[PDB]
Design a protein around this nucleic acid. Sequence first.
RNA 1: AUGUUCUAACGUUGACCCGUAAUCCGGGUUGCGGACAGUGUCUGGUGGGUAGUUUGACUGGGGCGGUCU
RNA 2: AAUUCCUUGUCGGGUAAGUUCCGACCUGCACGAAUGGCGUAAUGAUGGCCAGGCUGUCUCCACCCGAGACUCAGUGAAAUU
RNA 3: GCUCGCCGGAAGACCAAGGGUUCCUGUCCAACGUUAAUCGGGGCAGGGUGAGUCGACCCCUAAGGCGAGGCCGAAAGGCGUAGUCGAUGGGAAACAGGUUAAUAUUCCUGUACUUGGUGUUACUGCGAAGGGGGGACGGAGAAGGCUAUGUUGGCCGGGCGACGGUUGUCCCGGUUUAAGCGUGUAGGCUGGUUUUCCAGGCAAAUCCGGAAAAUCAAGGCUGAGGCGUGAUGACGAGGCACUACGGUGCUGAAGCAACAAAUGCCCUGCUUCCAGGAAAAGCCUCUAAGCAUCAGGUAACAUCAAAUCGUACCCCAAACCGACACAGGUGGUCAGGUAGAGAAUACCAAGGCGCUUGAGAGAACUCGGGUGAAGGAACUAGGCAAAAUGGUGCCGUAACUUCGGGAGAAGGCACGCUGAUAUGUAGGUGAGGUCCCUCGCGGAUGGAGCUGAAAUCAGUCGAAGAUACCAGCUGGCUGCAACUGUUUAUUAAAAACACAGCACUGUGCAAACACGAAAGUGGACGUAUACGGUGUGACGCCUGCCCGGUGCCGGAAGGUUAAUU
RNA 4: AGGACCGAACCGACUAAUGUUGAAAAAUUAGCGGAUGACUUGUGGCUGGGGGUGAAAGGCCAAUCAAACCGGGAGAUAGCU
RNA 5: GCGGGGUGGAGCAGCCUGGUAGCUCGUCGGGCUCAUAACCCGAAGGUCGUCGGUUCAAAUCCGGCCCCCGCAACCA
Lengths: 271, 46
Amino acid sequence: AVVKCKPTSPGRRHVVKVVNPELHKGKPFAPLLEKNSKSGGRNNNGRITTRHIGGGHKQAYRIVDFKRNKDGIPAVVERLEYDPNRSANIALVLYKDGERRYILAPKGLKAGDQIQSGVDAAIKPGNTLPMRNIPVGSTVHNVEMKPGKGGQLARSAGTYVQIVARDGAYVTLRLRSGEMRKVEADCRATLGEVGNAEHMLRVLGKAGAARWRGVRPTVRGTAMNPVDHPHGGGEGRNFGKHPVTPWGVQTKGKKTRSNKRTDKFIVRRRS
Amino acid sequence: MKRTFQPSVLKRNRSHGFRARMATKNGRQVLARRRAKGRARLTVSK
RNA sequence: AUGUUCUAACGUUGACCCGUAAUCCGGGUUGCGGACAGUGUCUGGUGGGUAGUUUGACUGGGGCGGUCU
RNA sequence: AAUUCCUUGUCGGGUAAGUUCCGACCUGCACGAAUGGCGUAAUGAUGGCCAGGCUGUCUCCACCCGAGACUCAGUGAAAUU
RNA sequence: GCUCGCCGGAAGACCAAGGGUUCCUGUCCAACGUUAAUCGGGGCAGGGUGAGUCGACCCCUAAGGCGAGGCCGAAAGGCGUAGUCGAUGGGAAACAGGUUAAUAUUCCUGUACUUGGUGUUACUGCGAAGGGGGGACGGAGAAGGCUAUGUUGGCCGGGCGACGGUUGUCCCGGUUUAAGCGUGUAGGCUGGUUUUCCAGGCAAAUCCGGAAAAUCAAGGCUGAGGCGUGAUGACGAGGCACUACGGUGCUGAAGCAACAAAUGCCCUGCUUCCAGGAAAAGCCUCUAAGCAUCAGGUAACAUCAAAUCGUACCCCAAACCGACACAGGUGGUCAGGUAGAGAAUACCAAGGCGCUUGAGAGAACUCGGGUGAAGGAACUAGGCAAAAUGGUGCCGUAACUUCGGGAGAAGGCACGCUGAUAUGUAGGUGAGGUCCCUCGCGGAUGGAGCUGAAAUCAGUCGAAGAUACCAGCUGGCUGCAACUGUUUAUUAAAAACACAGCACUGUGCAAACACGAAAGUGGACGUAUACGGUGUGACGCCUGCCCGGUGCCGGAAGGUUAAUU
RNA sequence: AGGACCGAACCGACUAAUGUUGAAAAAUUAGCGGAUGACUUGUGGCUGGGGGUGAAAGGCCAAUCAAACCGGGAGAUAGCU
RNA sequence: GCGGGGUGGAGCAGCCUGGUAGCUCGUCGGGCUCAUAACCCGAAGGUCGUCGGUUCAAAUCCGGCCCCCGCAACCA
Ligand SMILES: [Mg+2]
Ligand SMILES: [Mg+2]
Ligand SMILES: [Mg+2]
Ligand SMILES: [Mg+2]
Ligand SMILES: [Mg+2]
Ligand SMILES: [Mg+2]
Ligand SMILES: [Mg+2]
Ligand SMILES: [Mg+2]
Ligand SMILES: [Mg+2]
Ligand SMILES: [Mg+2]
Ligand SMILES: [Mg+2]
Ligand SMILES: [Mg+2]
Ligand SMILES: [Mg+2]
Ligand SMILES: [Mg+2]
Ligand SMILES: [Mg+2]
Ligand SMILES: [Mg+2]
Ligand SMILES: [Mg+2]
Ligand SMILES: [Mg+2]
Ligand SMILES: [Mg+2]
Ligand SMILES: [Mg+2]
Ligand SMILES: [Mg+2]
Ligand SMILES: [Mg+2]
Ligand SMILES: [Mg+2]
Ligand SMILES: [Mg+2]
Ligand SMILES: [Mg+2]
Ligand SMILES: [Mg+2]
Ligand SMILES: [Mg+2]
Ligand SMILES: [Mg+2]
Ligand SMILES: [Mg+2]
Ligand SMILES: [Mg+2]
Ligand SMILES: [Mg+2]
Ligand SMILES: [Mg+2]
Ligand SMILES: [Mg+2]
Ligand SMILES: [Mg+2]
Ligand SMILES: [Mg+2]
Ligand SMILES: [Mg+2]
Ligand SMILES: [Mg+2]
Ligand SMILES: [Mg+2]
Ligand SMILES: [Mg+2]
Ligand SMILES: [Mg+2]
Ligand SMILES: [Mg+2]
Ligand SMILES: [Mg+2]
Ligand SMILES: [Mg+2]
Ligand SMILES: [Mg+2]
Ligand SMILES: [Mg+2]
Ligand SMILES: [Mg+2]
Ligand SMILES: [Mg+2]
Ligand SMILES: [Mg+2]
Ligand SMILES: [Mg+2]
Ligand SMILES: [Mg+2]
Ligand SMILES: [Mg+2]
Ligand SMILES: [Mg+2]
Ligand SMILES: [Mg+2]
Ligand SMILES: [Mg+2]
Ligand SMILES: [Mg+2]
Ligand SMILES: [Mg+2]
Ligand SMILES: [Mg+2]
Ligand SMILES: [Mg+2]
Ligand SMILES: [Mg+2]
């Protein structure tokens, strides 16, 4: 549910919170946790390679099952959990053989719901099948791009793909971007949409809330000196040049895709 | 006011000590120069 | 010269086996691509991203104007 | 007008008297709509202006208490030439 | 030595880091010491640091470093796997009293504890480079229960006062005791227990996970404090005897209770929130290969071992960082009284100091303060500076507003002491007794003592009762930036930067993009509700016309046009 | 509850005066701002010079910064003093 | 200081590249209408800022003057 904070201080006036009462209040399932320490956006040369990354809260990594290859064995949803590592919530599921795993939580999934993977699974949200076995027109998420590799497409809160066509060995997918893409029919997908669609309605409200998420400030190129950035310079507010990145490439319209290896799979670009 | 030299024996030894010098070709060139010059104290190691 | 089809070069940041106590690497089996991609030499375009430099003299101070055979 | 040269524009307010301030006017040298326009409660060691209190800020200084300056003994510089 | 003054959330004490003999004694005073020096952190000589338990080392890992092979690179080299290092983090165990000139949880005295070896006994399934558990984790908040600690009474020992009074409702001092071991408490958490099964935990497992059944309800785990013992002891005022008159020797009373009470402890708890909160070993358990009257395991005794290195002294400083015995800088720990909300402030304790030139004088002028007739911003670029305001309770409070604010708006009134209510009240705390019980560290009753606001009424002193210290000036109109934040170390703190929000635009994952001759790495163990770039800058009302130029995007006939031939 | 309020420690640096051969190559005194957070701080680590890092001031990178320091080319060159 | 412009009543061409004044609107005359506007048909109207120079000949080319626009007017 989406709740607007009362303006008892100027940092609270604009805050809008997404509060989900279904989420587990306790600690996560410890056998499926590992550490993931922070980078500051620095590579193995030690240099900043992605700007504006630093600080924020410590976070444990939850091992999420994006492969969904434990076929033929039913699982029951134990609880939904907050995952700091992504926009979607995750669900702890218990397989009938006694194994527990985390999955991405689809829309509508609640504790006690039964799920299954494999060729003979029912066409029901949270069930995973090869897209050969999934009806054309279906909404799916967590879509594999290569068979066995694990889901890579439509994993963010509220996302999904539509299976628009099936032609031999391949299915055509409409992606959230608007791209039409071919994928091998043996690739798995999970029925339904990713949950937590209200994610996008949140309003952080204040500068510090972005700092908590490990985002450091952006300084505009036009606020700099010429030595620092192409936009830098001027006595007063001046510009008078075509917008570019800090490294001099045009940054308002110029296309940057260059991958002739994967062009064959793209039926229609997002446009 | 806080001045530039803030001593730490661990940082001294790790930064400029004999083993640090020996670890790289350019460090070994430092030692070679200092031996050739005939320095009494090759490194900060004490 | 296009178009298709193929596999056998080449790709794989799919899976699985082995070295092996190892998310490296290599070998193996398979799948998927496939003479494309990518790389080398040559070549047109673009290229203040970067570099080296040039940007005259006269002049009732210099600039600006004017001049220069 | 953080923008207006002419300019202390003009008219009104506030003052005995106001090149500043506030409100109008439009004749915009040379405002203007995300190099955003116009508003805006709250906020500000932010710029302007007005009042009450308060005062040695001032008319216009006086006196006092201490540390130096001054004399004595000891030690003992400097720039410069 | 006596007086005086100063610090006392420090200018006292204890450390770490850093330093290194500055420590303690004798001796010397040339140089050092901003003066003299008999003195010294100075010179010279001698002395002084004692550990199974404190720390290091050691075991374990974080970020990170190095890195067999490997991959890559003219060379040098780069990157990285297996590994191996790397604390600022996890991992056994000791306390009290006494002692030196100078060390002490180290010496000594008393009383403990821990881990390993080895042996005798009694049993007995042991076995890991593997599985599982545990270690093991956030912020804020709220309490209850305690204690350190203090206060007062009682008790004990001393006093009966330089000047009126002072055998008391009087004055001064003491009233201290550990670890350990027993107890298992206030409180926290958790149903036990037994059977049967089983696509899981890289193989197995009796372990863990799951499933189905019995059975029964108290099982267990954790835990401050208290209490008991340790302790017939230790310590103890003060007296007494020496004295080398510095100090040693000797002895030794009382040693309780109530109340108050931490920011410490229970508490790694509990409640709640979103930003979702290390790792590995020790440790516990399970088995595999193996071994099987052998090892191995476990228990109980008995012995033996616990090496090495640090340990002086300074440490908010004259010993460290600042060229100085330099108004500077420097992490952690301790936390007495009265007043107070308080770690503010004032005065004090314990403790420590008077800051290494003095003596006079009492000119101008400079510095830091005090007070000022009448006036009251006339000063000045400008109320700059100073003056003023200041507490608590109550009454009261405007425009405007995003309904939170504005607001401590503004303005006002009370305030000391003494008595009464009430020889001390409401409250808090609670002894004995009285009972009850699954007899405890139990319950109920009960109220002794102890503590103790706040108010009203009545008096009363002063010029003045928030008397000192301490402690908002306030209002009106306006520009700019929404706000909190950031910035030119050392002349600019702002209207600049950032910001939540907005928009454009790239990017389909081997993403774009960035660092890298490369291999790789970041982006991200993310996936378009995601990431990157660019502009704008909360919110409200909105954001008009122009594609000629110049960029970009799309097209692709025609012309022109490279290497090539 | 809160980048809430008032206020010590702590972090900072708005005003004045002093100092300016300083007590000090950036301080002191009196006032001043934040003070549960985009806070502050210890210990270790990482990024290297046309390079880093920068809530952006050409700031900072050992009292040095519109291109650090050190050594070398090196007795650079100097129609200039 | 440096560029630019002064052409029928209005706005605007013709200047370069000497001989030659165009365009749209307005004006006037006739029509259409009951009248007016509209609309139709026919006309008139700038020796070209002024003054000189040059040339066989000047809107034109050169110079002065007058007028009206720009720009520039700086560093201590
Ligand atoms: Mg994240
Ligand atoms: Mg942004
Ligand atoms: Mg700038
Ligand atoms: Mg540039
Ligand atoms: Mg400008
Ligand atoms: Mg250039
Ligand atoms: Mg050259
Ligand atoms: Mg040049
Ligand atoms: Mg010249
Ligand atoms: Mg003016
Ligand atoms: Mg006036
Ligand atoms: Mg006005
Ligand atoms: Mg503007
Ligand atoms: Mg627009
Ligand atoms: Mg003298
Ligand atoms: Mg104090
Ligand atoms: Mg010595
Ligand atoms: Mg001494
Ligand atoms: Mg002498
Ligand atoms: Mg002397
Ligand atoms: Mg000495
Ligand atoms: Mg490592
Ligand atoms: Mg390496
Ligand atoms: Mg090697
Ligand atoms: Mg190790
Ligand atoms: Mg340590
Ligand atoms: Mg001592
Ligand atoms: Mg007590
Ligand atoms: Mg506290
Ligand atoms: Mg000591
Ligand atoms: Mg000092
Ligand atoms: Mg001194
Ligand atoms: Mg500090
Ligand atoms: Mg005097
Ligand atoms: Mg004075
Ligand atoms: Mg005064
Ligand atoms: Mg007066
Ligand atoms: Mg008076
Ligand atoms: Mg005046
Ligand atoms: Mg005057
Ligand atoms: Mg003032
Ligand atoms: Mg004052
Ligand atoms: Mg104004
Ligand atoms: Mg602001
Ligand atoms: Mg601020
Ligand atoms: Mg400055
Ligand atoms: Mg990658
Ligand atoms: Mg802006
Ligand atoms: Mg703006
Ligand atoms: Mg606050
Ligand atoms: Mg600062
Ligand atoms: Mg300043
Ligand atoms: Mg101060
Ligand atoms: Mg504030
Ligand atoms: Mg405050
Ligand atoms: Mg510097
Ligand atoms: Mg250079
Ligand atoms: Mg040379
Ligand atoms: Mg020379």
